[PDB]
Amino acid sequence: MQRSPVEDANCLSRYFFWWTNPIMRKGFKEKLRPSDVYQAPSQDAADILAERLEKEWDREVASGKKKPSLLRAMARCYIKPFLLFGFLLYIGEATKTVQPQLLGRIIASFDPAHEPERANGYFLAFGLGLLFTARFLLLQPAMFGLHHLGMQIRIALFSIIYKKTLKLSSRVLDKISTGQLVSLMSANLGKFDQSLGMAHFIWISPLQCILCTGLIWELIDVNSFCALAAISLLGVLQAFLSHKMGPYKAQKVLLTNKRLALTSEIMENLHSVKAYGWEEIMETLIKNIRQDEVKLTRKIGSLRYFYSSAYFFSAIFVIVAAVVPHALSRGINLRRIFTTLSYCMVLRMTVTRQLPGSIQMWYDTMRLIWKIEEFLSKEEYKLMEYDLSITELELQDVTASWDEGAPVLKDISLKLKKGEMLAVTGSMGSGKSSLLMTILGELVPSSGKIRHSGRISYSSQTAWIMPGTIRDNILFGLTYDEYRYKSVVKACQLEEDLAALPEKDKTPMAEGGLNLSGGQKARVALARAVYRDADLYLLDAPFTHLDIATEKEIFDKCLCKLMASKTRILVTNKIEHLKRADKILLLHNGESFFYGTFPELQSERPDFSSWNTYVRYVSNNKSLLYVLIFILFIAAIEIAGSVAGIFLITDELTSSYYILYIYVATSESLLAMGFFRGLPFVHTTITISKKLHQKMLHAVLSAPMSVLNTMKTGRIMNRFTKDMATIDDMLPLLMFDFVQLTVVVVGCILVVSIVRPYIFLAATPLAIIFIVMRKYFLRTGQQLKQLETEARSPIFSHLIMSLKGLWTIRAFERQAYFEALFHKTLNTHTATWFLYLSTLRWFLFRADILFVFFFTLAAWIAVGTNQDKPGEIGIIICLAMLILGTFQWCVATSIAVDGMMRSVDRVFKFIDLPSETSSWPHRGQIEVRNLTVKYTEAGHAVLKNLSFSAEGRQRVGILGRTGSGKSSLFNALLKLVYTDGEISIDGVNWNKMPLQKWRKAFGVVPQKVFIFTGPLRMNLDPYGCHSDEELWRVAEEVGLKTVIEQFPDKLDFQLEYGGYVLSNGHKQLICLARSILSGARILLLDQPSAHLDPVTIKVLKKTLRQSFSTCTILLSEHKVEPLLECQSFLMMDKGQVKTYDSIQKLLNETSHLKQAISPAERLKLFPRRNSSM
């Protein structure tokens, strides 16, 4: 990307935006790409703004205040431009205050007498033009500069909070939810930048209004005292309505946050939710809180209507309060009423528009500043000091607990030398991870000293994968090597299956490694830890998804031979690992039973324990069209009354002009939308949003997996978060306001033109010139905006991803790397945003300069060919001056509404997203022949020529090497992937049946468990069509009853996503309980014994096999002891399945990839008949 031309440019160029010319011209001809857009300017880059603000905050915190404030630190580095651009806004708006007099002098000097003055018109008219043009010359650069400042504020705050959250402690990290932290940023991103202009009026409006009322006080009469009182009542009425919005608006945002949290859950675990068949249920779950939300929006909109309507209706009321009282005292003045009128309106504008919008921001921003200040002042993580003098780890009397400092760990003692491996072991929730967390330095111990050498590696229990390549995750910062890398891949047994992929290496992985298998994520995450050089290695249960063979090989080659002379701590429950290892550690409820060698354990007493966009929008709701006709017809007859109404006065009455000023001044109220006229528009434009949301959610949730796995979570979520909240909240009032301003201006321009026709002559040429200039901007800008909104998604997806696997980032000390990566994703965004914002200012500035030509040629053409002896064509200068003052505000909306309307197309893409359009037999007979499955169309084959059969209600066993396709078979059976064959059930297939009914036949328990936010009632049965004792029966049946009884509100216990409330094993136990209640013939089981103890499986199988009495089951496990119960067996090979009756046949037919792998305990029972001859 070439450097930004803004730096290498003239002042005159940067002021008038001449540098923008090429990028517009290129955008006009052809379509733009992310390659085409410029680099960000060097002044407002990420690294400089962060380094700036942090210093002032550091010293402000370091000074030792009673309460450190962010404003005091912030103000010291942003005061200079704020006041400098602020001064221009004051002198700019102060221009208005002197308009009444200059306007008032020419209209005064119209009819004093015929002869005294000639020059007065032209001099003061040219002066009015000079004074007018001085304003927007003075005013426009201030806005741009002051916006651009707000961008520099927001980039610094995103940077410093990210730097903070990366070093935030684990005790407090669990308390803070991710959704609210993201949603805090997602709302502000755009709004906060643009909002500063309104906020600067907090001292402008009070200073101006006192000077304004001081000048209108030149009216001695109490008449003036009556006139101003109309502004005060309106002003308090405005702020009164803003109060009533508060409790409704505040209560709604909370109710929104529930939905955005739930949509994030359902769409992250989108693979599982389809397999059960929970579309309409989830749609219903979303529809309730959605139904509750819209009810409040109606009230927020209805109050926000009168907020707008009271402003437009007040022109009639305010104007009569000046003139009619003055009729009592020294009546019908020559020129004082016009001055008074102009002072009355400019005052009204300030109280109605500026000051509420000013105190709107300051009241909002202080709470934002309070929360960030609170967030920056939280518990900080301590980095481990590295020193070489210590060579082996030392613990003594370690006691520790989460959120209290009963204890999690209690008085641990262990003494490990260099070049030794320890074996941690125990039951569910014994505290095996917490011991690693204390050694790691994440959890701080309360009473007990813990000492070690600094550098540590760590492999997590739930392995996570970065967005990039397999190489990137294995290397993970460190440089590439020839045989180091290869020895790790060879040792970790990741070489064969990696070669089998379509691309050899460097496969671009989706969110969380969905394109990789369950076991591969463990081995790649292992390899990561193996590849680096460190003193201590912590492997927290790496062999949970691996086979017996791969485990055996990895344990012999990788753990023993390759890591020889490295200290290891491995979590496991296998006799052979415990036997080979040096020292054992047996936890139980946070306290240790035994600590020593294996023969010493045996000598002890416990022997062995274990228009297209608009037409589609309007046509979605026909009720809005029946309103749209009403607005056009009434406005036309409202116009008809004014056209005819003037002539009645003009005929009775050269000097038929001063009434035209009052009409133009009074126009807004005459052409306003009444109570019956305006409210139906707001009602219909809400109801459309309720449907338009409900259509999208249904369309997105029912689509094929190849299309869904193409898209990331953020790309989808960005439609729900921003674009839906835009069309919900903002669009109704802006689309209301747009019609008003067009009807007023177009209505007014026609009727002022009908009198004195040749004023129309000036407007014909440039209006079309203006419309061309708009179409010139809209081609390049609107297109550039869509790039900016896509550039928003990588920020939050990078933020939220960082919080999931933060524990590793700390272990590998890669925090600075992620900051650098985070700034790159910002700089690409701000480049786009800065460019777009500049191209808007070009158009906005060109709109004003274009206005000067209309004005002067209207002045030049409107002139006496003969002697204009009344003169004062200046009054036409005055009529044009005021009417087109609001035209800038009318245009200002035109860009906002149109650009914001293009967010609707993004929804319309998702609505039109490609999708798929007797008693079911007790006989659970299933056969498959010549099946072939593929994930991506026109890609590689995962299965090829698969053929097998299962007997009616028979127990079948599936085996195979890790990454053979055991899950993909279940995806093929359930139709989540492309297939070529004929799967049969009772001599029936999908020829007649739809997918819905085909899905209800099965009972799934997937690899990845899915437990969403809500109570256990909603988890165990989302429909809600079961008895309590029926739920208690299955809780006893599964072997999950007691652990529920220990909780408060036993069955209505608030269960969060992730967390620590239930252990991993319990999440499987829940996932089984789903399939109990499902009531299906066929059951698909993808590794039930994942994080289950040997003790739990025996008590499971005892009671579980009487529940599943009359139903077929398809198991797929690496553990043998759960598997050996079932009848038939089938193994998965390179291509296809080959079947066997018994284990004796299976293991002997298999070529010692399982026979020589199973331990002496199964070789006790297996060779019993041969050896016991």
The tokens for 815 are: 């925090």
Contact with ligand ATP (CB under 6 A): which of 434, 830, 1019, 1112? 434
Distance separating alpha carbons of residues 327 and 228, to the nearest angstrom: 17
Pair 1083, 1006: CB distance under 8 Å: no
Q: Is 432 in the site for ligand ATP (CB under 6 A)?
A: yes
- Residue 430, annotated ligand binder? yes
* Residue 1008 found at the interface with ligand ATP (CB under 6 A): no
Closest alpha carbon to 281 in 708, 701, 696: 701
**CA-wise closest residue to 1020 among 1046, 997, 1044:** 1044
Amino acid at 30: E
> Is residue 802 a contact residue for ligand ATP (CB under 6 A)?
no
Q: How far is the CB of 816 from ligand ATP (least distance, A)?
A: 25
Structure tokens at 548: 């017996």
Please report, for residues 981, 987, 1019, 1068, the alpha-carbon distance to residue 1081 in angstroms, rounded to integers and kept in the order given: 22, 15, 22, 20
Smallest distance, Å, CB 1070 to ligand ATP?
14
Does the annotation flag 935 for ligand binding? yes
Q: Which residues pair with 957 in a beta bridge?
A: 1115, 1129
CB of 821 to ligand ATP, least distance (A): 25
> Cα angle at 233 between 228 and 235, to 5 degrees?
90
Instruction: State which residue, 425 or 689, has the beta carbon closest to ligand ATP.
Output: 425
Q: Residue 275 or residue 672: which is nearer to Mg ion going by CB?
A: 275
Closer by beta carbon to ligand ATP, 427 or else 642:
427
Closest separation between CB of residue 772 and ligand ATP, Å? 50
Tell whether residue 1060 is a contact of ligand ATP (CB under 6 A).
yes
Q: According to CB under 6 A, which one of 197, 431, 794, 1003 is a site residue for ligand ATP? A: 431
Cβ-contact 150, 195 below 8 angstroms: yes
Give min distance, CB of 618 to Mg ion, in A: 49
* Residue sitting closest to ligand ATP (CB): 519
**CA dist list (Å): 1107 to 41, 1001, 1099, 1117:** 68, 18, 13, 20
Q: Shortest approach of ligand ATP to residue 794 CB, angstroms?
A: 22
Q: Which amino acid, residue 898?
A: D
- From candidates 197, 407, 519, 747, binder to ligand ATP by CB under 6 A: 519
Which of 965, 1039, 1088, 1122 is in the footprint of ligand ATP by CB under 6 A?
Answer: 965
Instruction: Tell me which residues touch Mg ion (CB under 5 A).
Output: 433, 461, 518, 967, 1007
CB 463 to ligand ATP: min, Å: 11
What lies within 8 Å, CB to CB, of 1106 at 6+ separation is: none
Min separation Cβ 1061 and ligand ATP, Å: 6
By CB under 6 A, is residue 995 in contact with ligand ATP?
A: no
String of contacts with ligand ATP for each residue 548-567, x by CB under 6 A: --------------------
Tell whether residue 955 is a contact of ligand ATP (CB under 6 A). Answer: no
R_g over Cα of the chain: 38
Q: Footprint of ligand ATP on residues 493-512 (CB under 6 A)?
A: 497, 500-501
Separation of first and last alpha carbons in the chain = 80
**Candidate residues 718, 967, 1068, 1089; the one interacting with ligand ATP per rule CB under 6 A:** 967
Q: Are strands 1128-1132 and 955-960 parallel, antiparallel or unpaired?
A: parallel
Q: Which amino acid is at 366?
A: M
Nearer to Mg ion, 160 or 1090 (CB): 1090
Please classify residue 342 by burial: count the beta carbons closer than 10 Å to its beta carbon, then call 0-12 exposed, 13-18 middle and 19+ buried: buried
Residue type (1 letter), 1064: N
**Residue in 148, 259, 326, 545 binding ligand ATP, rule: CB under 6 A:** 545
Which range, of 210-218, 773-781, 794-802, 965-973, touches ligand ATP by CB under 6 A? 965-973
Q: Is 1054 one of the annotated binding-site residues?
A: no
Binding mask 689-708 for ligand ATP (x = CB under 6 A): --------------------
Stretch that binds ligand ATP, among 93-101, 107-115, 428-436, 786-794 (CB under 6 A): 428-436
The site map against ligand ATP for 362-401 (x = CB under 6 A) is: ----------------------------------------
Work out how close the CB of 1044 gets to ligand ATP at its nearest, in angstroms, rounded to a whole number: 15
The answer to whether 277 contacts ligand ATP (rule: CB under 6 A) is no
Q: How far, rounded to the nearest angstrom, does the alpha carbon of residue 929 sit from its chain's CA centroid? A: 45
964 near ligand ATP, rule: CB under 6 A: yes
* DSSP string for residues in 855-874: HHHHHHHSS-SS--SS--TH
Q: Does residue 965 have a known ligand-binding role?
A: yes
Distance CA 1003, CA 1113 (A): 9
145 annotated as ligand-binding: no
Whether 414 contacts 367, CB under 8 Å: no
Q: Which amino acid is at 387?
A: D
879-904 burial: b if 16+ Cβ within 10 Å, else e? bbbbbbebbeebbebebebebbbbbb
Span of 151-159, 297-305, 481-489, 961-969 interacting with ligand ATP by CB under 6 A? 961-969
Instruction: Output 70 or 400, the one with its CB closest to ligand ATP.
Output: 400
Q: Is 169 annotated as a binding residue?
A: no
Q: Rounded to the nearest 5°, which phi and psi values hold at 634?
A: -70, -35
3-state secondary structure 1107-1148: HCCCCEEEEECCCCCCHHHCCEEEEECCCCEEEECCHHHHHH
Tokens of 252: 């709604």
Q: How far is the CB of 985 from ligand ATP (least distance, A)?
A: 22
Q: Which string of DSSP letters, residue by residue, matches 639-660?
A: HHHHHHHHHHHHHH-----HHH
Residue 968 near which of Mg ion, ligand ATP, none (CB within 5-8 Å, type-dependent): ligand ATP
Question: Which stretch in 228-236, 290-298, 755-763, 1056-1064 sits in contact with ligand ATP by CB under 6 A?
Answer: 1056-1064
964 binds, among ligand ATP, Mg ion, none (CB under 5 to 8 A by kind): ligand ATP
What b/e sequence results for 518-553 when a residue is b if at least 16 CB atoms lie within 10 Å of its CB, and e otherwise? Answer: bbbbbbbbbbbbbbbebbbbbbbbbbbbbbbbbbbb
153 is a contact residue toward ligand ATP (CB under 6 A)? no
Q: Which of 356, 429, 542, 1039 binds ligand ATP (CB under 6 A)?
A: 429
Q: How many CB atoms lie within 10 A of CB 368?
A: 15
Residue 264 C-beta: closest distance to ligand ATP, Å: 20
Query: Which partner in Mg ion, ligand ATP, none is near 1064 (CB below 5 to 8 A by kind)?
Result: ligand ATP
Supply the minimum distance, in Å, between the C-beta of residue 1095 and ligand ATP: 13
> H/E element holding 154?
helix 119-165
User: Residue for token digits 């002198």?
Assistant: 91
Q: Is 242 annotated as a binding residue?
A: no
What is the 3-state composition of the chain as percent helix, strand, coil, each rounded to the nearest 5?
Answer: 60, 10, 30
**Binding residue for ligand ATP (CB under 6 A) from 428, 634, 734, 1104?**
428
Q: Which partner in ligand ATP, Mg ion, none is near 609 (CB below 5 to 8 A by kind)?
A: none
**Helix (H) or strand (E) segment spanning residue 414:** strand 409-415
| Distance (Å) of CA 770 to CA 28, 625, 764, 777, 846 | 16, 29, 10, 11, 9
Cα gap 527→485, rounded to integer Å: 9
Taking the least distance from each CB to Mg ion, the nearer of 430 and 802 is 430
Tell which residue, 1004, 964, 967, has the closest CA to residue 1131. 964
Pairing of strands 456-459, 536-539: parallel
In the complex with Mg ion, the residue whose CB is nearer, 256 or 967, is: 967
> Considering the rule CB under 6 A, would residue 430 count as an interface residue with ligand ATP?
yes
List the binding residues for ATP: 402, 426-433, 461, 935, 960-967
Residues that bind ligand ATP (CB under 6 A): 174, 402, 408, 428-434, 461, 497, 500-501, 514-515, 517-519, 545, 935, 942, 962-968, 1007, 1060, 1063-1064, 1091
Q: Which residue numbers belong to the known binding site?
A: 402, 426-433, 461, 935, 960-967
